[PDB]
Amino acid sequence: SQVTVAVRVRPFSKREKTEKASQVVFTNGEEITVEHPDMKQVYSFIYDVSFWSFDECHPGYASQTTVYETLAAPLLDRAFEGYNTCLFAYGQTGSGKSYTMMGLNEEPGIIPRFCEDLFAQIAKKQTSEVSYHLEMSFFEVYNEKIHDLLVCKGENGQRKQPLRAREHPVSGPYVEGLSMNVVSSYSDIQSWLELGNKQRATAATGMNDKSSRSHSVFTLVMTQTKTEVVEGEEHDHRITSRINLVDLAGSERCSTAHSSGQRLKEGVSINKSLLTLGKVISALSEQANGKRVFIPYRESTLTWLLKESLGGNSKTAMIATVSPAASNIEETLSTLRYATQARL
Amino acid sequence: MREIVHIQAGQCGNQIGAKFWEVISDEHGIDPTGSYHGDSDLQLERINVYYNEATGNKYVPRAILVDLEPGTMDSVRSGPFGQIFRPDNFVFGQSGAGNNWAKGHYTEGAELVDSVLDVVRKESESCDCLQGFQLTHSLGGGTGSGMGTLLISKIREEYPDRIMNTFSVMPSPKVSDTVVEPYNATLSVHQLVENTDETYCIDNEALYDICFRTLKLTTPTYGDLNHLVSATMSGVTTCLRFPGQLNADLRKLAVNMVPFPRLHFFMPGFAPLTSRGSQQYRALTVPELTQQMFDSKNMMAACDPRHGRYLTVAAIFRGRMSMKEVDEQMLNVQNKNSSYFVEWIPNNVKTAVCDIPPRGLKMSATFIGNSTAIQELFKRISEQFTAMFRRKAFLHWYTGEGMDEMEFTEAESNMNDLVSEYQQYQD
Amino acid sequence: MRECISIHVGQAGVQIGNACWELYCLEHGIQPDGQMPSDKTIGGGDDSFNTFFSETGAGKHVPRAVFVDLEPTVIDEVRTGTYRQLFHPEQLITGKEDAANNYARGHYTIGKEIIDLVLDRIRKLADQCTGLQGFLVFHSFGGGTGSGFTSLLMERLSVDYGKKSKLEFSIYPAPQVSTAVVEPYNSILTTHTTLEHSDCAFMVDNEAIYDICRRNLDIERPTYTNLNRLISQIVSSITASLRFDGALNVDLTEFQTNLVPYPRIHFPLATYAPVISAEKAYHEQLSVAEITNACFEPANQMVKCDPRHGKYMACCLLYRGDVVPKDVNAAIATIKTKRSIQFVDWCPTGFKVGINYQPPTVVPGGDLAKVQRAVCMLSNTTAIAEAWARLDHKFDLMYAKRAFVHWYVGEGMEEGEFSEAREDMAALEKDYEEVGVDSVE
Ligand SMILES: CC(=O)O[C@H]1C(=O)[C@@]2(C)[C@H]([C@H](OC(=O)c3ccccc3)[C@]3(O)C[C@H](OC(=O)[C@H](O)[C@@H](NC(=O)c4ccccc4)c4ccccc4)C(C)=C1C3(C)C)[C@]1(OC(C)=O)CO[C@@H]1C[C@@H]2O
Ligand SMILES: Nc1nc2c(ncn2[C@@H]2O[C@H](COP(=O)(O)OP(=O)(O)OP(=O)(O)O)[C@@H](O)[C@H]2O)c(=O)[nH]1
Ligand SMILES: Nc1nc2c(ncn2[C@@H]2O[C@H](COP(=O)(O)OP(=O)(O)O)[C@@H](O)[C@H]2O)c(=O)[nH]1
Ligand SMILES: Nc1ncnc2c1ncn2[C@@H]1O[C@H](COP(=O)(O)OP(=O)(O)O)[C@@H](O)[C@H]1O
Ligand SMILES: [Mg+2]
């Protein structure tokens, strides 16, 4: 039960290239400094992993292959071992999060590499005796209420059913009424994810207008039928593995952003949720050292749905996208301090 | 102005509220005909917190009554202080709960909760600014557990921003006036901790012991017991009605006394309390009251705090007194008895003072405490529950009314997780 | 021609105001109805001085202040009390709901819906003023109103007005004594924002005045009325040169000019040395020497902070009554001869002096005695860093378990505004250290 926290600094965009915006964050190997332009002082942050993607020729540059091969493939092999995995993702609008997990049509992220390497290893490991079968799911959390995204809504005030979570004693928590759909190639995943992210809830306070106001979990349950009892050869014990990949929303200060009504609730819940997650992550990094603590999964929905993917003999990974400009100096600080507390 | 809506369910809630109003009216100068016959003018400045106005200087309380057998509402009507209530708020039905949490939550409670919310919306929309709700119900039973928790679930959706307390009468270890106490209490805790802000766990063993040892009474009936719960209820909302040197309200206490949201079950207490004979030999001062408050033979929780640690404590005083005495005494408590207070909260205490004491006393005090020892009050039920649930003793009266076994294991695991949460801060 | 607008936030603010304005009404002869018999007796004078009290054509005098609490229980004692005919009925009784001892609720959620009225009334008051110099705010750390609404109001005022003094008499939390678990968080979040706006932020501590009462005045069971009167005496000693005629006048542009070396270290301490009763009012000479020696005496300070654990950067001494500068020169030389009182190596002067002729007034139903002379001292030290560190340790104990945070983020706050304030307050503690270092060649 070890959780790894990482960071990836994005390189300058064309706009902030032209405006000659100032660089505030620098790298010394595994330490990352943030320097207020020259104002008074600088803060220094340390993480288990650090990806300096600011310009191409720096040593320690982090191509997408490096991000996958360092963060994800351990999740793959630990899943084939038979255990479960949870990958997180945090970053405010304009940090390089969509480029990271999904990517572009010529610059892959984490998800396509994950699925493609998965099906390749399956189809080469598939035998006359062994077999495999995968099933997906994709849902969201909005104001501590669950919603499924694979459904094609009609026309209504809202075709968003607030499903309820339950606690089966053996398997643990689950969602009542969750659409689970089979998969054997990655295109079948794209066909669902495009629809889902089209059905994801988004809103505009005054900033970038298409900003997510909800959490989104993409889960894959994978089965191993390796086991054939030679006494009669009809099926026996069987392994199952859960792989959760969750895209979160931003902290969002509610004062600088003079918000009202539904734009406040949407933000309050997200703040609460992230805090709960923080405590969990912290406690697990305090749990590996060998102490006695309590992991409060029940103070949030996202944690209660994922009690079994984090705790126990499972793996967890967190990556935090940050922008190096000077305009976005408060947001980056928030992100880095969040991930630091996730480290300790 | 702030405004409380007082819901009350079951025999316990009816019989507690009928005394609570009997006291608030005395404090504010109201008579059982609704009329005002007081002396002081501060009794009317903030009468909008509990009462509403009417034509001939009448004052009708904002009380809602949600039983399911008329046998008790008739006793309130056919009583001393029954006429002041609004007859359109005496909600009731028939086909009683049979002391079953199922009937009061799914079958014979869903058929009536709408008629209750119809009154709640009337009495809430008619307010300048509501602060929150209140409730008085008994776990272990039926109606008060089921319909109460259902109304909580339905009020927390409409009014999430506002406050929702519950003066809950928890079961007792030794005595048991009902045989299905555990199964109902567990399912009520499963629906309270997610949907409450500050509840006050009460146990009748503690009140019998208070009535026997301290007040030195030989024939304590439930009227003499609820006479204490009324006092606590009144003390919580004193600084919301009367002035003070350092005022307070419900939200202040809920902020100071709830470090984490799942931990809002409090042990209450009231001081002074003396036998009629022994009132000539006691000095009415702050330290005597503090001694009586932090003693374990006055808390209503039926739970020894010395077996745990005080996460947070609140003291609401009433009378012309000093602000040095309170601070000094509370610091002395934090320092001497440090083993009963956490260390990652340096000051585990707070204070409120009102300048207006009760009708017959020169000083009064009220005590609220969040203590880890409360796990004993649930660790017991989880023994009674599972022993009965290991082989499904009285369960066919619950399934047959539209339930399933998973709904029991849910509540069991939640209650146990709460135990483990309060144990984290014990050693 | 010499005006100062007072602002009162919270229970602490309003009660300090009910003391201060009683005092000011007594000094100037104003009755609680706002009238004056003296000006109709002889026909002259400006005893009801235009620094604090306005005037209209009916010989009435209204104060230049405004109250606000976000809770109606307090102001409704003023509206329904002995001083009801004095205040303009525009007192903010916005008693929908209180802050619940939460900075987040007195900054964004409930802190709006009031603030615009406050700004309107302050403009209405300033437009009635000619030569305004000051905005004396009285608030209290620990509370939600005094922590949040004060910060927001000062944010707005540093834009609307700008090159105007904005002082602050706050109730700083005690090291042991306190009336809430959430005192630290609110304090550390207030000092982070009320450091770039304010110009001089005085500070007191109720533990110190409690110690003063049972050792100077001989009161073993005091109450807040016995403390806010001393605070009113402080403010009167501060705001007397604008009212009464004296030798060495000292306005508000001089306190901020001779006690703030650098713009971040403007947190001084106060003392009012004669706190004796009418019995001990006799048996004692009460000369300038005794008093000035009492100001630098621990156990007579108003913040629990031993200055011998630090150094003095500057100190202003404002005297009242029968005083001659010869005695002040003597006493300053005496204090500079001593060795327990360390002054920095970059301030040999280290002394501003102010003298006035009007002695203090005696409030009936009071505790203090009549005296022919009185004194206030305001002193900047490097020692008050100790209290900041004490509070920061409590912060760092609770914020690690992430206790009491969900009540804040449930009211419009993220988790980063905390760590932005503990790292902003962990630099001022370093500044007060750097200033304490003797220079080197
Ligand atoms: C002169 C004197 O002190 O006599 C007391 C008295 O003997 C004592 C014992 C009173 C008495 O209380 C009881 O008799 C009692 C009996 C059973 C269970 C609980 C109490 C008293 O009735 C209580 C009564 O005080 C009050 O009534 C309070 O205002 C109380 N009033 C009511 O509850 C009330 C009930 C029904 C109708 C109208 C008012 C109250 C307490 C808290 C908040 C609001 C009101 C007074 C002076 C006394 C007597 C009369 C003996 C005490 O009452 C309280 C709650 O403080 C019980 O111990 C205290 C201390 C008093 O000394
Ligand atoms: N010296 C002095 N301190 C006071 C007085 N009243 C309150 N305080 C202090 O102020 C602290 C908290 O402030 P509050 O009394 O809650 O007033 P507030 O700032 O408006 O807080 P809220 O009412 O909740 O918004 C208390 O802990 C007291 O220590 C007073 O009259 N005199
Ligand atoms: N304190 C108090 N407890 C009561 C009273 N009447 C019943 N009880 C308790 O309530 C429990 C049974 O609850 P019940 O009255 O059946 O609630 P209901 O199911 O809603 O009617 C028992 O454990 C009793 O001890 C009362 O008047 N006062
Ligand atoms: N490692 C990288 N190399 C080059 N460009 C990047 C990298 N990471 C992010 N970017 C740029 O940053 C932008 C991120 O925009 P967007 O996808 O809206 O971020 P987010 O998904 O966090 O809102 C992309 O246009 C992309 O070109
Ligand atoms: Mg207040």
From TrEMBL, chain B:
GDP 1 binds at residues 11-12, 99, 138, 141-144, 175, 181, 204, 222, 226. It comes from Sus scrofa. Belongs to the tubulin family. Dimer of alpha and beta chains. A typical microtubule is a hollow water-filled tube with an outer diameter of 25 nm and an inner diameter of 15 nM. Alpha-beta heterodimers associate head-to-tail to form protofilaments running lengthwise along the microtubule wall with the beta-tubulin subunit facing the microtubule plus end conferring a structural polarity. Microtubules usually have 13 protofilaments but different protofilament numbers can be found in some organisms and specialized cells. This is Tubulin beta chain. GDP 3 binds at residues 11-12, 138, 142-144, 177, 204, 222. One of its GO terms (cellular component) is microtubule. GDP 2 binds at residues 11-12, 138, 141-144, 175, 177, 181, 204, 222, 226. Residues 47-244 form the Tubulin/FtsZ GTPase domain.
